[PDB]
Amino acid sequence: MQIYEGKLTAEGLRFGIVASRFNHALVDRLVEGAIDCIVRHGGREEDITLVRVPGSWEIPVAAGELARKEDIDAVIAIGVLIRGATPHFDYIASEVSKGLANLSLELRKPITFGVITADTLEQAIERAGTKHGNKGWEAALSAIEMANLFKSLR
Amino acid sequence: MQIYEGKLTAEGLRFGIVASRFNHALVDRLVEGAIDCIVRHGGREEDITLVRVPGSWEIPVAAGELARKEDIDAVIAIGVLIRGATPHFDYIASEVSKGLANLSLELRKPITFGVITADTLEQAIERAGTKHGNKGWEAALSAIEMANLFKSLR
Amino acid sequence: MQIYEGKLTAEGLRFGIVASRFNHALVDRLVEGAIDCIVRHGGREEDITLVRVPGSWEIPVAAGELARKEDIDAVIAIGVLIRGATPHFDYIASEVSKGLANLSLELRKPITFGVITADTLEQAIERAGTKHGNKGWEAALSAIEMANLFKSLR
Amino acid sequence: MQIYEGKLTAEGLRFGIVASRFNHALVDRLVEGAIDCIVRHGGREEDITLVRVPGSWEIPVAAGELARKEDIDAVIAIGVLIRGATPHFDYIASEVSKGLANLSLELRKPITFGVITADTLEQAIERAGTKHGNKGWEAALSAIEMANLFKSLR
Amino acid sequence: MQIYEGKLTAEGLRFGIVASRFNHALVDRLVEGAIDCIVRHGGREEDITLVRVPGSWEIPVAAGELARKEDIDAVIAIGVLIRGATPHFDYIASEVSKGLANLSLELRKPITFGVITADTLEQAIERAGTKHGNKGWEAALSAIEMANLFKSLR
Amino acid sequence: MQIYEGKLTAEGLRFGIVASRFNHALVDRLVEGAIDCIVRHGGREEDITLVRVPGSWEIPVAAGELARKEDIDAVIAIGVLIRGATPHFDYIASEVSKGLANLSLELRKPITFGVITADTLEQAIERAGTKHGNKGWEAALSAIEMANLFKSLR
Amino acid sequence: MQIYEGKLTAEGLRFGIVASRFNHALVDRLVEGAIDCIVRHGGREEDITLVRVPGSWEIPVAAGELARKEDIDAVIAIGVLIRGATPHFDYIASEVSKGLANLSLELRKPITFGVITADTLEQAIERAGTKHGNKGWEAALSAIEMANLFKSLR
Numbered sequence A, B, C, D, E, F, G: 001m002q003i004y005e006g007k008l009t010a011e012g013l014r015f016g017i018v019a020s021r022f023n024h025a026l027v028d029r030l031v032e033g034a035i036d037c038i039v040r041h042g043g044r045e046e047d048i049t050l051v052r053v054p055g056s057w058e059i060p061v062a063a064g065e066l067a068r069k070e071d072i073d074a075v076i077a078i079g080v081l082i083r084g085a086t087p088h089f090d091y092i093a094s095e096v097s098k099g100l101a102n103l104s105l106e107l108r109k110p111i112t113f114g115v116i117t118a119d120t121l122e123q124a125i126e127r128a129g130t131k132h133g134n135k136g137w138e139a140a141l142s143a144i145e146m147a148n149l150f151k152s153l154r
Helices: A024-040 A056-067 A088-107 A121-127 A135-153 B024-040 B056-068 B088-107 B121-127 B135-153 C024-040 C056-068 C088-107 C121-127 C135-153 D024-040 D056-067 D088-107 D121-127 D135-153 E024-040 E056-067 E088-107 E121-127 E135-153 F024-040 F056-068 F088-107 F121-127 F135-153 G024-040 G056-068 G088-107 G121-127 G135-153
Strands: A002-004 A015-020 A048-053 A074-082 A111-118 A128-130 B002-004 B015-020 B048-053 B074-082 B111-118 B128-130 C002-004 C015-020 C048-053 C074-082 C111-118 C128-130 D015-020 D048-053 D074-082 D111-118 D128-130 E015-020 E048-053 E074-082 E111-118 E128-130 F002-004 F015-020 F048-053 F074-082 F111-118 F128-130 G015-020 G048-053 G074-082 G111-118 G128-130
Touching: A002 A135, A015 A024, A015 A056, A015 A135, A024 A048, A024 A074, A024 A111, A024 A128, A024 A135, A048 A056, A056 A074, A056 A088, A056 A111, A074 A088, A074 A121, A074 A135, A088 A111, A088 B056, A088 B088, A111 A121, A111 A135, A111 B056, A111 B088, A121 A128, A135 B048, A135 B056, B002 B135, B015 B024, B015 B056, B015 B135, B024 B048, B024 B074, B024 B111, B024 B128, B024 B135, B048 B056, B056 B074, B056 B088, B056 B111, B074 B088, B074 B121, B074 B135, B088 B111, B088 C056, B088 C088, B111 B121, B111 B135, B111 C056, B111 C088, B121 B128, B135 C048, B135 C056, C002 C135, C015 C024, C015 C056, C015 C135, C024 C048, C024 C074, C024 C111, C024 C128, C024 C135, C048 C056, C056 C074, C056 C088, C056 C111, C074 C088, C074 C121, C074 C135, C088 C111, C088 D056, C088 D088, C111 C121, C111 C135, C111 D056, C111 D088, C121 C128, C135 D048, C135 D056, D015 D024, D015 D056, D015 D135, D024 D048, D024 D074, D024 D111, D024 D128, D024 D135, D024 E024, D024 E128, D048 D056, D056 D074, D056 D088, D056 D111, D074 D088, D074 D121, D074 D135, D088 D111, D111 D121, D111 D135, D121 D128, D121 E121, E015 E024, E015 E056, E015 E135, E024 E048, E024 E074, E024 E111, E024 E128, E024 E135, E048 E056, E048 F135, E056 E074, E056 E088, E056 E111, E056 F088, E056 F111, E056 F135, E074 E088, E074 E121, E074 E135, E088 E111, E088 F088, E088 F111, E111 E121, E111 E135, E121 E128, F002 F135, F015 F024, F015 F056, F015 F135, F024 F048, F024 F074, F024 F111, F024 F128, F024 F135, F048 F056, F056 F074, F056 F088, F056 F111, F074 F088, F074 F121, F074 F135, F088 F111, F111 F121, F111 F135, F121 F128, G015 G024, G015 G056, G015 G135, G024 G048, G024 G074, G024 G111, G024 G128, G024 G135, G048 G056, G056 G074, G056 G088, G056 G111, G074 G088, G074 G121, G074 G135, G088 G111, G111 G121, G111 G135, G121 G128
Parallel strands: A002 B048, A015 A048, A015 A074, A074 A111, B002 C048, B015 B048, B015 B074, B074 B111, C002 D048, C015 C048, C015 C074, C074 C111, D015 D048, D015 D074, D074 D111, E015 E048, E015 E074, E048 F002, E074 E111, F015 F048, F015 F074, F074 F111, G015 G048, G015 G074, G074 G111
Antiparallel strands: none
């Protein structure tokens, strides 16, 4: 059988991170976790490009610029959405996830989903470096794997 | 009437399988079922390409690379999503299904959906080689049929 | 006012029918109804092309091949989805409807929706040749009208 | 500041109306409303093109043909969907709205949404020329404004 | 086996329609439906004879005159009965259905039943061109089939 | 289309009225209403023939004599049934309506149904010249229309 | 038949608007809506006369002065009443509506009713440029139609 897979060593890999600023007390923990994952898997901090945008709505259009760079191997999208009183959350979460997924297919380049979409603040806290882990660290680990996979698959 | 259909013998057919790693104790049973269905329908194991990706989110972008290969007749997407506490599942399930369906139409090549989308762990276990069958085996059987069909349709 | 409309006589019209095999005891009644509608409206059975696929998921990619044929005036998509225990139904029904609607716009050719999307088995039986009619007959009648319409509109 | 807006006089404007036939006792009041709004705003009835299609599902593909005409300034989509027993309504309403919205962007031409999407028959009756007005008349007024706006914006 | 059936093309067929005036806001949609079905199946509008009578009670005696015409191939009976406070409805619906059924047998000529017999106003509205279709259109389609059938059977 | 209808002017028309005597305090108001309708629509009182019978049961056999007269253009049947304690009402109401409907078809002559069939005395009072109108006036108006119709239809 | 109607183009039309000041946060949205409706239907802002009065009670006497002007084609009355704790609202709403209706008849000149009469503050907000529209815009549209009508009717 032909088997393709990505290892988890990040030597020589170059990452773009797009991180929104809303809910920054939680997004900043996700960014810390993504950078930590990259660096302790052997990626250099100098080969990370960090783009900041105001809210999760603006993540896609910035990720589309970063993922078009030839010297970016994968993009990690980071943000925190917490449901408020209206259906606003539904439309933002829907379009942020659709836009990143579409951009990954269009550009044929891994874009990983480090965006929390929580009903409650407690759930967001749990996923931003407390009892359910750190979704930024997880999205960066996925991006390492996918960049390594794409060195033979793409 | 002109009637087009695919038979279920897999001699000479070449398959791509993209299988995510999350929930691997269940995904691995789906992969076993897909390979068994191919091989005991006459397909050779050497004509299977298996691509591993970290999560269901990353299945589409890998399936788009595999489906673009001229020597792949059909792609079988395999993964297991189980709803958690937040709406995350909804956005991942929505984009994985949308991306695979879109890629199948864009590339005019059968891509079959062996991805469980369960509300509970019990429902995923049921569909991964226990009391409700094996969705990997089912998605491979669909891909056999579709690849045969496309020998005259495409 | 300029008024465009399609009549319901099917002389000289050529139809493609894509029908899935899952829930075949019901889909086969929808296929009977579509062929009967075409033939008793004056269409010839020789000018029907029937393509079988395993499940509703595979309808779109087969319909995209049939709709691209220059000698097919309209495509009728036929299948039966019944909700199960998990959200699987939602993702399949969503992508089958999206893919067919998208193909119709991309290819500028009528593709009619004879796909039952039922919560219960009883509702599917009602719509497959019993007390609420036959959705295959209805989708064929719509395709007759739209093909005649497009003789002047397209 | 530069300010662009459309007035509501319809002299010289040319409209396409696509109206489905299902629920025709209500759709026909919406069509009456749209024509009345155009004509009493100064538009000529001869400058209306009316296309009939069988159901709301078929509105998009017909609107795509009408909106491509160089001599059509805006398209008004008219139809009535009323929820039935199954989830069918959800998929039809979803793709009709998606397809019109997408066509408007692709063709860079206003397409207005005079499609009722009601849970009950009572709600549809209210919106088709009774206590909550006439959605046909409203979609026509929007299309007059948009066609005038696009004489300077487009 | 000898098989007799009628097709649904209406070329050269000549219809009588008897339509009562009570509940005319609904009956008039049934009449619209019957004429539309005839005409778009290929029947000429000039070959329709429309007789108006005051109530459903008077439909039979008028249908008896129309069905005796040698140049009428089938009669379509159209009316709307809605149950009131007394048992009146029962006696009217009973004799209207009995009288049409008896006339069809006595005159050996198809007479189709496009008469709504509803418990509620809502039910009548549903059946006169809204969510349960148009009983006029249905009774016309039956009369087209029956007139064609009788060209070989009678 | 050929269109047959009756106007509501009664000049030269000749009517037979058969009215029972039971519940005469109510039937006599129905008779007043029928004569008033005829006369103020231009019919002459001299061209009315009134036949009295004891009960609603006897209306049909008397109406069959009046309808056979060559110089009677239409017959109006008038009576009031009110449900009692036993099923008697059901059998009388059933046979009176059946007999009148049958005679109209046999004799090919309009016979209109001005017979109240009420569950309560209050419902009969409502329909005999109070809050729900006068069923004798209504049956006479129907007979005027049908006699004028039959001048061209019969 | 002779048919008189007003179109909705406002070229050359001259309007008087009488608007009270109580509940001005809402009345001022109604005034914006009336002026916008006039101007975007082709009326000139220079041909509007606006009269301010303290409360709805004072609208009639000011409207009677404006309606008597030979160069005013129609008057639009604008104000917002919201029920308070006492029956005061009833007497004010009753006399404002009576006075305007009476003046319109006495002076034979259209006076349109853009006065909200609400039980609650929420209902007034809904009708002053939010979810149930803008009653000032609606009263202006009615005044445009009636002024055009009276060019031939008066």
